[PDB]
Copies of this chain bind each other. A is one copy, B any other.
Amino acid sequence: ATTHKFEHPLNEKTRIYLRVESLLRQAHLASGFADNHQYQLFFRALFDMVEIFEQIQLKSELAKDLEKQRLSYRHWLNVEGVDQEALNSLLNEIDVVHSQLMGAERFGQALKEDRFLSSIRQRFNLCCFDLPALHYWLHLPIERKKHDANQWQKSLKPLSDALTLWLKLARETGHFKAQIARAGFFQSDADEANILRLHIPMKYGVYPMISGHKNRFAIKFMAFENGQACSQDVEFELAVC
Please give the residue numbers on chain A whose beta carbons come within 8 Å of chain B beta carbons, in ascending order.
1, 4-9, 15, 18-19, 21-22, 25-26, 29-30, 35-37, 40-41, 115-116, 119, 127, 129, 132-133, 135-137, 139, 141, 202, 206-210, 222, 224, 226-227
Closest-CB distance, A88 to chain B (whole angstroms) = 34
Residue contact B41 to A129, C-beta cutoff 8 Å: no
Of the candidates B35, B202, B222, which one forms a contact with A29 in the assembled complex, judged by CB atoms under 8 Å apart?
Answer: B35
Interface residue from B5, B116, B224 paired with A137 (Cβ < 8 Å): B224
Q: List 25 contacting pairs A-B, 8 Å CB cutoff, sorted by A.
A: A1-B141, A4-B136, A4-B139, A5-B139, A6-B132, A7-B129, A9-B129, A19-B127, A29-B36, A29-B37, A37-B41, A115-B226, A115-B227, A132-B207, A132-B208, A132-B209, A132-B210, A132-B222, A133-B222, A133-B224, A135-B207, A136-B206, A136-B207, A136-B224, A139-B202
A124–chain B nearest beta-carbon distance, Å: 13
Which of chain B's residues have a CB closer than 8 A to the CB of A22? 127
A164 to chain B, nearest CB (A): 15
Q: Nearest chain B CB to A172's CB is how many angstroms away?
A: 19
| The 5 residue pairs across chains A and B that have the minimum distance between CB atoms | A22-B127, A136-B207, A132-B207, A4-B139, A136-B224
- Tell me whether B119 and A227 are in contact (CB under 8 A): yes
Chain B residues with CB below 8 A from A115, complex form = 226-227
Known: A35-B29, A37-B26. A18 touches B133 (CB 8 A): no
**How long is the Cα–Cα vector from A206 to B9 in the complex, in angstroms?**
46
Q: Which of A5, A8, A132, A222 counts the most B-chain CB atoms under 10 A from its CB?
A: A132
Residues of B within 8 A of A5 (CB): 139
Alpha-carbon distance A49/B4, docked complex (angstroms):
30
Please measure, in the bound complex, the distance between the C-alpha atom of A227 and the C-alpha atom of B134, giving whole angstroms: 12
Complex alpha-carbon distance, A49 and B5, angstroms: 31
Question: How many Å lie between the Cα of A35 and that of B28 in the bound state?
Answer: 13
Residues from chain B with Cβ under 8 Å of A9 in the complex: 129
Q: A26-B37, A119-B227 are in contact. List 6 more A-B contacts (CB 8 A).
A: A4-B136, A9-B129, A18-B129, A30-B37, A115-B227, A136-B207
Cβ of A4 to closest chain B Cβ, rounded Å: 5
